[PDB]
Amino acid sequence: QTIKCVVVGDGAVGKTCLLISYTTNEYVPTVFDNYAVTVMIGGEPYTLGLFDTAGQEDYDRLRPLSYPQTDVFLVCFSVVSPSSFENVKEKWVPEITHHCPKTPFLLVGTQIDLRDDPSTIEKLAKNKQKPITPETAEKLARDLKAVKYVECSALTQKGLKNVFDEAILAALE
Amino acid sequence: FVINHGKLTNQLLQAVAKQTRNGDTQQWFQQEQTTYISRTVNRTLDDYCRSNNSVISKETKGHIFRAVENALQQPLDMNGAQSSIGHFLQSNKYFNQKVDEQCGKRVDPITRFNTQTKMIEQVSQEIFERNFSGFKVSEIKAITQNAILEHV
Structure with a gap:
């Protein structure tokens, strides 16, 4: 009864x-x-x-x-x-x-903890870039058929537990 | 417990062959080799830092990787950490049948899972050493330890 959750990405x-x-x-x-x-x-x-x-x-x-x-x-x-x-x-x-x-x-x-960081926005503001927003994020979650879209910070742990509760929720089908 | 590493390898190779059409396994072999060895190296570094509470800068980590790289005459990647051999076993029927047999009396989803991960570590190392004799795991570990000693 073990749910297999694989973490992918860059x-x-x-x-x-x-x-x-x-x-x-x-x-x-x-x-x-x-x-x-x-x-x-x-x-x-x-x-x-x-x-x-x-x-x-x-x-x-x-x-x-x-x-x-x-x-x-x-x-x-x-x-x-x-x-x-x-x-x-x-x-x-x-x-x-x-x-x-x-x-x-x-x-x-x-x-998402660095989204509120000048250094990052600054050295992101370089190549004509800005951090990504939940709005722009959901639209892609939509376009790609993702179940949902969630965010968190391994650092602050904000939204961490939620990410995994939803993972389980999604798997329970 | 006993398992036929040869049959496993054939099943692992078969899975690799589905990726292309000519059933090539050369690219897979190259990638897994530098990956498995790199993870073995990173694992040794983790064990070293844990017991010593040390913190090695990524610079020093690189010197250690190049040192092990030169000693083995094998290209490495300091981000290596997940072997496709261990992941292959995770969803392999034959292997999991052995996991069950091994869990015997216990089937606490957790205990079974940990037993699975422990067996995955043991069997992939065995699978690696029989098909990738560029150097053995104990050797890789020792060479790395000597690098840590030299540069850390």
């Missing part, structure tokens, strides 16, 4: 930090091992299996082996990284849709 999106931050509920390692946790939803105890894909961003021959039997994908992008948001529509959704057309996925925005 590197520097913080996928690993996202899973570690969530499972710290110590030394934060580089290599995150498959981790399962029991989550209560509607009075029922569900077992959530978490799987990281960190490092395979551009090892196209490796990624496909992570997909069989996935119940829900978390397609992530950094709100402060227009190129990661753009790769969701360009690389990730097409990839998961290809290998798992019936498998649901949440559009996930990370590092």
